[PDB]
Design an enzyme around this catalytic site. Structure first.
Site, PDB file in Angstrom:
ATOM      1  CG  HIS A  41      -0.443   0.500   2.464  1.00  0.00           C
ATOM      2  ND1 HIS A  41      -0.222  -0.342   3.537  1.00  0.00           N
ATOM      3  CD2 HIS A  41      -0.172   1.756   2.900  1.00  0.00           C
ATOM      4  CE1 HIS A  41       0.150   0.376   4.584  1.00  0.00           C
ATOM      5  NE2 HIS A  41       0.181   1.672   4.225  1.00  0.00           N
ATOM      6  CG  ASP A  89      -0.180  -3.799   2.815  1.00  0.00           C
ATOM      7  OD1 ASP A  89       0.305  -3.366   1.760  1.00  0.00           O
ATOM      8  OD2 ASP A  89      -0.435  -3.059   3.774  1.00  0.00           O
ATOM      9  CD  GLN A 182      -2.267   6.176   9.748  1.00  0.00           C
ATOM     10  OE1 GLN A 182      -1.936   5.803   8.624  1.00  0.00           O
ATOM     11  NE2 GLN A 182      -3.301   5.657  10.411  1.00  0.00           N
ATOM     12  N   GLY A 183       2.654   6.082   8.556  1.00  0.00           N
ATOM     13  CA  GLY A 183       4.048   6.368   8.255  1.00  0.00           C
ATOM     14  C   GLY A 183       4.988   5.191   8.562  1.00  0.00           C
ATOM     15  CG  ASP A 184       5.556   3.607  12.283  1.00  0.00           C
ATOM     16  OD1 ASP A 184       6.609   4.243  12.088  1.00  0.00           O
ATOM     17  OD2 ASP A 184       4.820   3.729  13.305  1.00  0.00           O
ATOM     18  CB  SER A 185       2.825   1.344   6.048  1.00  0.00           C
ATOM     19  OG  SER A 185       1.615   1.376   6.763  1.00  0.00           O
TER      20      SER A 185
END
Lengths: 235, 59
Positions: A41, A89, A182-185
């Site tokens: 993603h 993912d 958020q941002g750690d994906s």
């Protein structure tokens, strides 16, 4: 990462940060000198991506950084097969020039399907990244890390209305307060086995961050280790 | 058997004839002398911290 701690330089040498239309928008892990594994993603086609290995403080430097351009992106073929599910993912990024391995740039170990699962089953893994340090808040400057306990599947299923597939797992605390965000994906969920770390999951999704009763959801790497090995062979 | 303590293998274990066991390690490592432990076979093998951090010790 919400509720974690500052990493020390070189503590997670396999961690990389991805930069593009948005700076430091996702994380990733070094598979080898030419390949990064991340979340699908984070890289749905288009835009130009830059990878920075040996990163620690996004606004300073110790001269350990290696920046590379992404020449190829391979999202898992079944990602986005089912709209808005986040199933499968995971994605691979090929670098233009090989990374030079050293104490600040080192691959994460990847066991076979059976052992990756056994390692996940140890029940305690580390997650890291430069993502939000507060739900709806600012992003981190210094790489953050946090140990998160595995959550039994039944409890996982009951924590949310969304579907948790066999390709995902839950991790976090019953009281909340500590979580990826958020941002750690794309960043790694890793399990340390007698001093050696193995990739056990990929930071993928969740509902807000660090909420009591909710958990972070991770891509179950064991289901994808054969695919990773097949696509990242060096010639 | 890999039944107990992973057959004493530091990394991977596979059962062998007459309840024997064969230990193995991931890429970048090699089975040590004891045929149980895993030993670095490259300068920078996967998953290990080598900066050692800090510098206040015997070394």
């Amino acid at each position: 990462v919400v509720g974690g701690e500052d990493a020390k330089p070189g503590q997670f040498p396999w961690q990389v940060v991805l930069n593009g239309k948005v700076d430091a928008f996702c994380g990733g892990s070094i598979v080898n000198e030419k390949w990064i594994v991340t979340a699908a993603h984070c890289v749905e086609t288009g835009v130009k991506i830059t990878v920075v290995a040996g990163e620690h403080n996004i606004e300073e430097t110790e001269h350990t950084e290696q920046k590379r351009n992404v020449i190829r992106i391979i999202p898992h073929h079944n990602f986005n097969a089912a709209i808005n599910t986040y199933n499968h993912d995971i994605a691979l990024l090929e670098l233009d020039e090989p990374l030079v391995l050293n104490s600040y740039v080192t691959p994460i170990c990847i066991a076979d399907k059976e052992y990756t699962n056994i390692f996940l089953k140890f029940g305690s893994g580390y997650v890291s990244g430069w993502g939000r340090v507060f739900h709806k808040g600012r992003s981190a400057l210094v790489l953050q890390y946090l140990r998160v306990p595995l959550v039994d599947r039944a409890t996982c299923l009951r924590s949310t209305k969304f579907t948790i597939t066999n390709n995902m797992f839950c991790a976090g605390f019953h009281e909340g307060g500590r979580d990826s965000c958020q941002g750690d994906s794309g960043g790694p969920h890793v399990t340390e086995v007698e001093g050696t770390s193995f990739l056990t999951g990929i930071i993928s999704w969740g509902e807000e961050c660090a909420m009591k009763g909710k958990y972070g959801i991770y891509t179950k790497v064991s289901r994808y280790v054969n695919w990773i090995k097949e696509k990242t062979k060096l010639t | 058997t890999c039944n107990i303590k992973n057959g004493r293998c530091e990394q991977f274990c596979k059962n062998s004839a007459d309840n024997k066991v064969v230990c193995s390690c991931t890429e970048g490592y090699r089975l040590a002398e004891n045929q149980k432990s895993c030993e670095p076979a490259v300068p920078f093998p996967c998953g290990r911290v080598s900066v050692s951090q800090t510098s206040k010790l015997t070394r």
